[PDB]
Amino acid sequence: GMTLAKIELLKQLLRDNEAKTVLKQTTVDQYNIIRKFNTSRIEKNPSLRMKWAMCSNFPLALTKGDMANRIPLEYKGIQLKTNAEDIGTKGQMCSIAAVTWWNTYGPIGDTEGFERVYESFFLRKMRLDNATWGRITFGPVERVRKRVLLNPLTKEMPPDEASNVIMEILFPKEAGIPRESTWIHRELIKEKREKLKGTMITPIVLAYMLERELVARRRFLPVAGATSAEFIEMLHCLQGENWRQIYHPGGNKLTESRSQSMIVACRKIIRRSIVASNPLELAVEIANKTVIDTEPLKSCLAAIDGGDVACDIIRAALGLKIRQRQRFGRLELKRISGRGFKNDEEILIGNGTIQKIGIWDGEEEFHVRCGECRGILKKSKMKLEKLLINSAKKEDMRDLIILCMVFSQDTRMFQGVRGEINFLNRAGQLLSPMYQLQRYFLNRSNDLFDQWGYEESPKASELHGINESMNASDYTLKGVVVTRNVTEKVSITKNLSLIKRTGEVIMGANDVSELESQAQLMITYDTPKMWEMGTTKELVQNTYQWVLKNLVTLKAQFLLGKEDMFQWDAFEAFESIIPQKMAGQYSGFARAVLKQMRDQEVMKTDQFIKLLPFCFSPPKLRSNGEPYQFLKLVLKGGGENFIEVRKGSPLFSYNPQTEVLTICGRMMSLKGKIEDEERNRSMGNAVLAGFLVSGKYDPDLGDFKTIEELEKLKPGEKANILLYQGKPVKVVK
Amino acid sequence: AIERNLARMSPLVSVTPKKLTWEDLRPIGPHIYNHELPEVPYNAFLLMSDELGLANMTEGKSKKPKTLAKECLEKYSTLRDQTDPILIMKSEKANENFLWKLWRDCVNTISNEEMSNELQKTNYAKWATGDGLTYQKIMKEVAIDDETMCQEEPKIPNKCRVAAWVQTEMNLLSTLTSKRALDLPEIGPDVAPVEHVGSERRKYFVNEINYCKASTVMMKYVLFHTSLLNESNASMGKYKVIPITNRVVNEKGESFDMLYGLAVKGQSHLRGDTDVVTVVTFEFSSTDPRVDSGKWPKYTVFRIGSLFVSGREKSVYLYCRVNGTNKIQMKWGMEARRCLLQSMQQMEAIVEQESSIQGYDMTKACFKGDRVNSPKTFSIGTQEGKLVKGSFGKALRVIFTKCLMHYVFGNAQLEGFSAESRRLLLLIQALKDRKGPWVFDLEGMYSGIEECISNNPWVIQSAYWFNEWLGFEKEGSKVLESVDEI
Amino acid sequence: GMNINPYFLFIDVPIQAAISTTFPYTGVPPYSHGTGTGYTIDTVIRTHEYSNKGKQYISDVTGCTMVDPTNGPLPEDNEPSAYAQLDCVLEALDRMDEEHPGLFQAASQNAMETLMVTTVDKLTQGRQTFDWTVCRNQPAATALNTTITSFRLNDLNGADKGGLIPFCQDIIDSLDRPEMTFFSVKNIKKKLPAKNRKGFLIKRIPMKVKDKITKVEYIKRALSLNTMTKDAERGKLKRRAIATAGIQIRGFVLVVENLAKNICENLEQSGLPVGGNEKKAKLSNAVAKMLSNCPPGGISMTVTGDNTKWNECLNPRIFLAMTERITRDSPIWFRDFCSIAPVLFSNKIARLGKGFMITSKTKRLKAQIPCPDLFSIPLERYNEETRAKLKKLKPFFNEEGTASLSPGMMMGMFNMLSTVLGVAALGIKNIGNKEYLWDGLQSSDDFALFVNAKDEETCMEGINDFYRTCKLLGINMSKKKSYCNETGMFEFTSMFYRDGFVSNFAMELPSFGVAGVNESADMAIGMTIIKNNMINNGMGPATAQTAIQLFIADYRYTYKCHRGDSKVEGKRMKIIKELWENTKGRDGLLVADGGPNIYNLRNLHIPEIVLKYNLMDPEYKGRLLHPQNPFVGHLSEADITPAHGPVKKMDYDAVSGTHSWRTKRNRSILNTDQRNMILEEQCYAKCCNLFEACFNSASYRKPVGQHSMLEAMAHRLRMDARLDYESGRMSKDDFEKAMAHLGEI
RNA sequence: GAAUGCUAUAAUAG
RNA sequence: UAUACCUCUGCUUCUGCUAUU
RNA sequence: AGUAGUAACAAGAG
What we know:
The structure is cut from a larger assembly and holds chains A, B and C.
Chain A: H1 3-15, H2 17-25, H3 31-34, H4 46-53, E1 60-61, E2 81-85, E3 92-94, H5 96-105, H6 114-117, H7 119-129, E4 132-138, E5 144-149, H8 159-170, H9 180-184, H10 186-195, H11 203-212, E6 218-223, H12 229-232, H13 235-238, E7 243-248, H14 255-273, H15 279-289, E8 290-292, E9 295-296, H16 297-303, H17 309-318, E10 325-328, E11 331-337, E12 341-349, E13 353-361, E14 364-366, E15 369-370, E16 373-380, E17 383-389, H18 394-408, H19 411-415, H20 433-443, H21 445-450, E18 455-456, E19 475-476, E20 480-482, E21 490-492, E22 497-500, E23 505-508, E24 523-525, H22 536-549, H23 551-560, H24 569-575, H25 580-600, H26 605-611, E25 632-634, E26 642-644, E27 652-655, E28 660-663, E29 666-669, E30 692-695, H27 707-711, E31 718-722, E32 728-732
Parallel strand pairs in A: 17-20
Antiparallel strand pairs in A: 1-3, 2-3, 4-7, 5-6, 8-9, 8-24, 10-11, 11-14, 12-13, 14-16, 15-16, 16-17, 18-19, 21-22, 22-23, 25-26, 27-28, 28-29, 30-32, 31-32
Chain B: H1 2-8, E1 18-19, E2 54-57, H2 65-75, H3 77-81, E3 86-89, H4 96-111, E4 118-119, H5 123-128, E5 136-137, H6 140-145, H7 164-174, H8 193-210, H9 213-234, E6 239-244, E7 247-249, E8 255-259, E9 261-265, E10 276-285, E11 300-308, E12 313-326, H10 327-334, H11 339-358, H12 363-367, E13 377-383, E14 386-391, H13 392-408, H14 412-433, E15 438-439, H15 442-450, H16 457-476, H17 478-481
Antiparallel strand pairs in B: 1-15, 2-8, 3-11, 4-6, 6-9, 7-8, 9-10, 10-12, 11-12, 13-14
Helix pairs in contact in B: 9-10, 11-13, 14-15, 14-16
Chain C: E1 3-4, H1 9-12, H2 37-49, E2 55-58, E3 65-68, H3 86-99, H4 104-117, E4 128-131, E5 136-139, H5 140-153, H6 164-174, E6 179-193, E7 200-214, H7 215-222, E8 224-229, E9 241-245, H8 247-265, H9 276-292, E10 299-304, H10 310-313, H11 316-326, H12 332-346, E11 349-351, E12 356-360, E13 365-369, H13 384-393, E14 397-398, E15 402-404, H14 415-426, E16 436-443, E17 446-453, H15 456-473, E18 483-486, E19 489-492, E20 495-498, H16 519-535, H17 541-558, H18 571-582, H19 608-612, H20 618-624, H21 677-694, H22 697-700, H23 709-727, H24 732-743
Parallel strand pairs in C: 8-11
Antiparallel strand pairs in C: 2-3, 4-5, 6-7, 8-9, 10-17, 10-18, 11-15, 12-13, 14-15, 16-17, 19-20
Helix pairs in contact in C: 2-13, 3-11, 3-14, 4-8, 8-12, 8-14, 11-12, 14-15, 16-17, 23-24
Chain C binds three RNA strands through strand 4, strand 8, strand 9, helix 8 and helix 9.
């Protein structure tokens, strides 16, 4: 019965006419202004002020209470506290020795439900404690800066939803309007309220602790193949720029996080296997030794029922039943008839902008599902043909309709985009348009339905239509029907295609997604040369390192047998980071320059090193025999993932002065591994295939010629070329 | 409109661009080479390479600063007892009689059997700590009527020339000793291989610095500033003698206490952070101040005896200086330990870089060298106009030493120089990278760098070293002049 | 001998790679001393120096000497110009609007919708604000309170409605009041009985008195800016002046900034408001595309740029134009709302500060001359430097000791909007369809212009044009600081690009110290900084492990809490050593209790209490985590009502224990006449605490209601009592008193 | 095979 | 003046905006 | 004196 006291203390307070008027005039809103009212300035140098203050006699202020009085004035000739009261706490000031006294000879309080209150932190420690550390590995790591979750949540909610859930637990009376969110987390509230029931910790602390494990802490971090929160929390020990440490958290790991990481692995395997002769051979080699956190990939694919084309391809490659089951966030499909042909086109959206989306051609039928609700969907290129659905939850039925309409990529659905939609984030990174459109129309459904159309309902046996309200109605949306009703052997080609017993194909290596994304869990490849499924810059650096390592042998062997040492496992891996549609031509160019050095004697060891890896892909010359010429060699990834022919590039550059080679910001020395005559020996010779230097810039010849203009010269014709800035060179064909 | 305005705008408005050539980069701060200017004087708080600590081998477990200073002087009684002022050097506005009286007061007070280290406010101690030297406040009304009361012309830092002792400090502080000072506390046991790599990597990095001269000097500054702050707040109104003390460990693993001298702390009623508290220092040294006389105009020196430096009987002097710190400098002194981090990280970067290239841990390889790789070397300095290389360990220590000097000579002059020079450093890297750089107003760029060079020993020597290094790069560039030139 | 040179590292390692070694951040940052009047007067002189050729006129509102550079004569030299042409700005804005279609209205919408929801308490979060009632700086939260209390006296109750809009309406309305009245406290002696010889005691009680000011005197105060000097400004020789603005002006700045932020977020070349990793990502992505999209057989160049006299030249009247253009399709009220903040800045007045101190070396006397009495003594008295300043100040000086400052943005709180003006310049791209093409990045005054062209000679012709363009917007590119080179390496906001943004561990080294919050908090911060630096700032595992060591040392010295087994003599150490001997589970003792450090790389993220909880002693943990310990201060029930501060949400994870204490408040206030404010503080604190006792949720979430605080408190207690009676918690005798006492309200 | 966007007392940056 | 060899004080002697959140 | 450096502290107040 604290009520009585409060009421009486109000009467005490209301005697003071200053307080009386404050309470009368100051609104409940304005509490937030007067609470923050203070006299003092903001301490700009607290590090200093603290260091200084700790040398004083009584720096700390107790709270005026009976407990404060359990501390003695002094202990064995040490002034623990003073009689003088603090301005703030209105309680006796004390020394830091007071704290130490309390902790040594103070009263022993009750710590009941402490581990329940601070469970969040104990789990954090438990995950470290019940962990297993693998091996540290030294080698280039391409870290990507992505927005990730810092701490594992018990259940994720928006701030507002979380705030109301927290209110229901701690402060039921001052909750306000009951939101539907209250009912959704009914078990969580009930659970938490029972666990925190036995406690003597301040409610404001309990509030922020629950907030810590409900509100999401999602911030940008440099990551490399580990997005899961339980990994992120240990990000400092996971890797650096030039090293990587294997780490397995404790407790549990989510099946969805297993699923999405499983996909990434399968895609990486396929993306590398494609380039090898007999891809299935290499695919199998890797997949068996591919581990996800601690669970093998083969085991993962068996256990998990889901995944994309890549998962099924590898499943077939291993010898496991392929699942035609797909996912689109909340929607789960399983194809029965049709064939998907994804193709990038410029879609114009309702608001009045153009976005590059992949559209799927052909007539297809799937078994759509959303929780308790089920159905069958028939679609075509940017049009929903027909959609049969079941009858279950009113809200679950409502979602499936929206999901299926979006999944269809209907021209109507794109035209109903009215508002602010973001396909590019604040840091100018891509957001998946189809998954963004899924989130948008899941909220604003009223606009979608109106911009779609309506028609007469079906008049069949068990077929009766539903309208906007999601009840049985005469009007229904164009291609919507509600009903009362709810394994074949495959083989895989060595070239990675799933052929049926008849002969028609279900999937191919060409059908998997090109996108490379950060795995949720840590992918390990338990094979030597695991780097092969790395990033562009990882593969690029390791290759050129392997060239330098064996430069003694590779350069010598080249001067004997021509094409004996062009086929190497490093250069195979290196091909998989080259755009396939330009790989052939690069090899045609590189080999032609390589041989040109050997034959005509005009060598260049850095240029040898630079181009040698490109000489793997079977060459592809022009129609007139002469190879393709190039200024730069563009590779998979960002605009800075390119090699230069004449100049240095962000990936590769040589400093003759220091004889230092710079590969992806790492500095290697070519001192000792360089010829004496090579110093003054110009680069002009090893820059264009079937071209050699004659003299210097001749103004009579005119300006510098492009790739084209040089390619369109008759053997014997001279020309002007610019290698890097301020270095003209006159060259013949 | 833009096009129209651009047309009618005067051509005199332009960036006036020019392509940078090595020849355009003249030496920064030409005045520092002019002999007419005075040799930049030593102006640190404590001595560094000129230091001398009286070694008192202790039980190993700690004791009171008065007690350890007493027992340390008890050991070296011949120095402690010397009561005859044999004056060598005398600072212009100093007082030989007072300073010596003060020294003796310190020695006597520290040696007595009392608990307190308070000094009575004598005629000499009052002069020494600048007693009652603050001007009295008066009303504006009275000040306005007084014609003789004026706003004083701001005192500007005087211009100085290059001094060899700065070079010599860097040279000596870098070098290895047998003595370990650092007080690095315990850590949790290793589990993760990262931690195991880190620990083994520490054994190389930490030791290399810990076993150098610069390391002790730092710890001296830290530990002194630590107690000097504690006295300043606790004993505001008391003149107090504070021993310049430090703990050292030799190869055999024995704890020696090092008494480098005694200091006295004036009244320390510090409201503001910038508010000054006068500290008069008395420091032991084997350095003969007659040698480099232009280095010690701020100091007053007394020959106080002799000691065995090895087989040689070196004479022991006593450097006496009135100094001053404020609430900030003392705090930054206690946070000087972080000099280790700036120096360690930078060199660890190299190890980690090299490690990715080779595929294994290149820590042990870079210092010593292993079966595969021979040890890493760095262009370290010069010897009669010819570049010289040095160890990874040497290169490490130079950076650590450099970082300590950033603290020790840390003011607005250094900030300004370091920032504006970084601008010019990058232009050189462009020329090195052959990324043909352009400039708009080079003189203006220089101005900002050159105006910062006044009376900072570190800035002045950095301006020298920059000019030296520039000349060598300017030579190295030549190699690239004729490349792919037919 | 062998003479070591540290610059010889740059032979073996490129500058960018080891840029860390060029930041001396183990050194002391520059601090100012005494007065900022010298530094302020300079700003005032220069600002008008760059606008002196514009339209000079007298304000018929304040009587001040207003100067207007806009639409002025174009410069004849490279000296800083503020003579920005409106048409050139509007064109640049149009170009921006074309290439970013329907962004202005999109931002104006969101900004407008934001304003509607925005409460007044939004103004209670901005350090020291100028309080016009007392003509000195106060905490933001108090500055608002003082204004609200004063507004009520003049019949202005817009603040009571809760939203920012009606409060803002009151601010612009308050300018129309003929006289403004405000409370200012005076002390009063009063006899009070006591166990004294004479049997009484005199005590000084404060009482609020209503002071008046005229229409003009209030306006000037509303337009006033308090001036200081920027302390701890790194990498700069000579000091610079800054300014804090009034609560009146801060209300309108919020919207204009919010508007500009919305625009910036959706701009390709904006460094704001993105920060850290998000920024690095954006700029890394941006550099890649602008790099690769260069014409083949051409030269891409990067001008590492910097704008000198940024705030001094940029004019409010241009910022007014910017709002009018951006709010094209917004309703008339919102167009007018946004227009106020620029208008106020265009008529702003600068307070000159503390004044100058005059001395006599012979007499050893010093005295501060206030700014009103600055021209009291002859100018022969002042030093040569100051003498000239005062002469040049004269035509802008106000006799009450202020300065008219129509041009410039002295306070500079249009970071976003000034960035937009910059981006708009980068938006031009080309002039007269020449053989170049420019596009850059912009973080306020710092910019990085890329130029793709045929030859470097042509690139220069483009940079020359970009330079000349900026001059038309009132943006002056520093010729002295800015430099140019072939693309691959540049500097932007002290982020150093060399085929990728390099690591620069030195910059944020000063964060490795003891934070100065308290023992429990600083430990977490310490280990969190180390953890975060291992990630972002590329600190290796050796340096990281040492970073722990060096921290623990600092911590053990600062909080004088060395290891219990150590023999380091001290006052706190005496009890620590007893605790060491008493305790069995010494591995469970925290470091601050003289316990051993068990932190390593792997467990930086875990609280020390939670790490050691399981290996603590039951008596020790009970003491350490006592739920009614007096060091932290809990709740409860007699009359516990101290000056409590609202408990914030901090990022560091730490447990509430005895080491989570608070320091005693600086007692300098007890000498000065500001004494009185303590009672005012404790008065509010009395109310707020009882209100918190009534509504426990008020601590967690902001309570809402335009009704009276007393009204709310009454009803809740009435309900509580009624239910407590019927339930059987409260007795009849108590319930009699309950309803009786509540009846008296 | 995507997301989920915010708000500290330190430090750094502008 | 007096109490005063007493008493009180040690960021408050004007420390801004914005981003990393 | 000294700290220091474009202006201060070298105690301030009843």
